[model samples]
Target: SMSVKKPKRDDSKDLALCSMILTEMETHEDAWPFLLPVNLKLVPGYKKVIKKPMDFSTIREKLSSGQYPNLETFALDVRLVFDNCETFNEDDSDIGRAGHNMRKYFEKKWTDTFKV
Candidate 1:
């Protein structure tokens, strides 16, 4: 038999954060294009799954559907994507600075919004 478990109390908060991050990425012109390639490289089966640049809509759908088990994992994934961005560019370059700033922003938001 299949077992079903209810969501935890923190789930709503996590969902809200996920939605907020995705929305921010979608609306921010520089952030989206900068992060798209990073995200594409991280996704499994990137060659088969990502025909076009990864967008906020796809991220939102995945988040809402519980593609990640929890907020922490989701945040880690975001950080890893940003880390990859940093890796691909020289530290003094514009893209590298942007990636660094984006990561800082994410860390601040996570700290302010969640207990963990």
Candidate 2:
């Protein structure tokens, strides 16, 4: 007999649900984290992660290609920022600011790249 583990039912769905709740409750610029937060600690080269401006050029490429034909990749990209952006905030000054800035950054980059 082999032991097996099952993921919680509706885990990703719950994440999406909570994300929606946060977005609805917060202001326009504040809802992004529930959507994406680049986690620096996950990278081995922590210093390098901060050396360059957080750019979603690759994500933009994928999105622009429109080849994914699935929303998971798109949602995962946004959720990354929503999950990890706060790690950049040691002072806890304004966590929402990170999300807001990230939203602007991604939106601008996407618009510039795709002219959408």
Q: What's the residue-level lDDT of 53 in candidate 2?
A: 27
- Model 2 spans > 4 angstroms off: 1-55, 94-96, 100-116
Tens-digit lDDT string for candidate 1 (9-109): 65666788777876775566457535344354565655564333333355566687879788877776677656665645667777777778777877777
* TM-score of candidate 2 on Cα atoms, chains taken together: 0.34
Q: Could you give the C-alpha RMSD of every candidate to the true structure, in order shown?
A: 6.5, 12.1
Candidate 1: pairs in clash: none
**All candidates: TM-score:** 0.65, 0.34
Q: After aligning candidate 2 to the native by TM-score, how far in Å is the CA of 2 from where it should be? A: 26
Tens digit per residue, CA lDDT, model 2, 1-116:
25776654333343344334334324445443343324566656544644432324444454556543444455456545534454445435566576656556555544443343
In model 1, which range of ten residues has the least summed lDDT?
49-58
Worst 10 residues of 2 by lDDT: 17-26
